Amino acid sequence: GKRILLLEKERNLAHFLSLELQKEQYRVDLVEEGQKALSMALQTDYDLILLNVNLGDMMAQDFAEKLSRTKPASVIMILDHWEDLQEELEVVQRFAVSYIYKPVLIENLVARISAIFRGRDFIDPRTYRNLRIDVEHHTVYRGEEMIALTRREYDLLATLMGSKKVLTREQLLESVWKYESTETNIVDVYIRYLRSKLDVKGQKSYIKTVRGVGYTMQEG
């Protein structure tokens, strides 16, 4: 059912991951170059794109930016060595739904992919202040400009906007990282990223930190 685009620079690992993911009944398209991966992701809606930090002909960050122009909520996961991921950690957190270290254990990869899919599917209010949300296409517009929220950022905004009450970090973790089974610090990171996308200098932020409680949407 679900469709995976896979670009892995280690050939034997690429072949192993392709075969093992197909045993889970995923359709897997293996590609060797970033330019080809981008052309395919532009024409097909993949449920997961699994890449290294560097695709060879371009960085994953560059791939993700180019894809985001038309598919901003694309679901990208990064598999790489610890050193390579940590060298690009802030960048990766800002475009990738998740990351996983080499050497990979296949049972762990399979479990994490399943959780990511189920957290998106469960998720899958149309205005707030100057924002308009297109829930069918997972797109957000602040005025006549598209705001290129990532999948995680979109899911976080939808959770905040869908709740009349203030939400704790633990509630936001359970909604936006559903099925992934504990550290709420990640919520604070993605709140920071989301504010960076939505907020206008000299306006009140779109997100209020509520003392002793959590986060909620904020009026102008």
HEC readout, the chain: CCEEEECCCCHHHHHHHHHHHHCCCCEEEECCCHHHHHHHHHHCCCCEEEECCECCCCEHHHHHHHHHCCCCCCCEEEEECHHHHHHCHHHHHHHCCEEEECCCCHHHHHHHHHHHHHHHHHHCCCEECCEEEECCCCEEEECCEEECCCHHHHHHHHHHHHCCCCECHHHHHHHHCCCCCCCCHHHHHHHHHHHHHHCCCCCCCCEEEECCCEEEECCC
Length of the chain: 220
User: Structure tokens of 25?
Assistant: 């009944």
Residue 76 pairs with which residues in a beta bridge? 49
Backbone angles phi, psi at 52, to 5 degrees: -90, 170
Backbone angles phi, psi at 152, to 5 degrees: -65, -45
CA–CA gap between residue 212 and residue 178 (Å, rounded)? 23
CA 1 to chain centre: 20
Closest of 180, 18, 9, 27 to residue 79, by C-alpha? 9
Instruction: Report, at the CATH architecture level, how domain 123-220 is classified.
Output: Orthogonal Bundle (1.10)
Where exactly are the structural domains of the chain? 1-122, 123-220
Strands 48-51 and 76-80: parallel
Strands 207-210 and 145-147: unpaired
Instruction: Name the CA radius of gyration of the chain, rounded.
Output: 18
**What sign has the CA pseudo-torsion 134, 132, 142, 118?**
negative
Contact 99, 78 (CB under 8 A): yes
Distance set, CA 82 to CA 16, 103, 124, 156, 158 (Å): 20, 9, 32, 27, 32
CA–CA gap between residue 38 and residue 51 (Å, rounded)? 11
Angle, helix 11-22 to helix 106-123, in steps of 10 degrees? 60
CA–CA gap between residue 174 and residue 186 (Å, rounded)? 12
At position 8, the amino acid (one-letter code) is: E
Topology of domain 1-122 in CATH is Rossmann fold (3.40.50)
Strands 207-210 and 214-217: antiparallel
